[PDB]
């Protein structure tokens, strides 16, 4: 999750706090996840062979 979020605290009331992100340090981006090819489409073939029964 590339953002390098900072750590800011906001006071609510008696002996309590509400912790949020204050600012984004660096370059903003999005959350993403790799899945390598020749490992999922080959494995999808493994499911359909047993699903061909």
């Amino acid at each position, epitope marked *: 999750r590339p953002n390098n979020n900072t750590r800011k605290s906001i006071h609510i009331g008696p002996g309590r706090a509400f912790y949020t992100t204050g600012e984004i*340090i*660096g*370059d*903003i*981006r*999005q959350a*993403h996840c790799n899945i390598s090819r020749a490992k999922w489409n080959d494995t999808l073939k493994q499911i359909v062979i047993k699903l061909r029964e």
Partner: antibody
Amino acid sequence: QVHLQESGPGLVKPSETLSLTCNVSGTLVRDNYWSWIRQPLGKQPEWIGYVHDSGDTNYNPSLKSRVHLSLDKSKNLVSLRLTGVTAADSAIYYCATTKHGRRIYGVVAFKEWFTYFYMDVWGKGTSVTVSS
Amino acid sequence: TFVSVAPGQTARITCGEESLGSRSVIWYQQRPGQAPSLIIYNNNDRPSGIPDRFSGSPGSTFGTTATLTITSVEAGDEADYYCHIWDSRRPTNWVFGEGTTLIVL
């Protein structure tokens, strides 16, 4: 080598249409990006915008409604038009080349990257004075 | 600002605001009575025709400022320098940065 020469009227009355002519030699105007830079005396240069024949052209939002750019393929020259000139426009025009660069810091998809522009070859420049 | 340095020494020029996002800083050198020319792109890359004496700080350490460092400054290097800012979090600058004048003694 690419050599650029600019010509103009020099003295322009207020509220008139100012036109420039940028002679281009040694290269074709279709294969390169072109931009115009206006530099006030004693101040930093100010960028107007970059133009191309393919339509990938953007302008300064401060001067979007008053500037017009055109290309002459037959005569191999670049012209600029500006209407509603004021006394704050008394500066020096420049006709310079523009090359595009790609900055890729992140995923190549998802439209995170931003492109940049730099000036390679500059013209000699011409002096434009606006007065009544 | 104003910078004074002896000939043959190393001088540093600081231009622009503190770093907020990724930087691609463009530098120019303008002699008096002349026009600026291509000096630095991509904060450390130069086109053919100029030596390696011109160096620039990379745009990696966030919270800092872009810096121009020149080694063994000679008498002909006395010219106006202007910095251009490209940032991923700041809008595209249509005006160049404030100039810095260096003095060679």
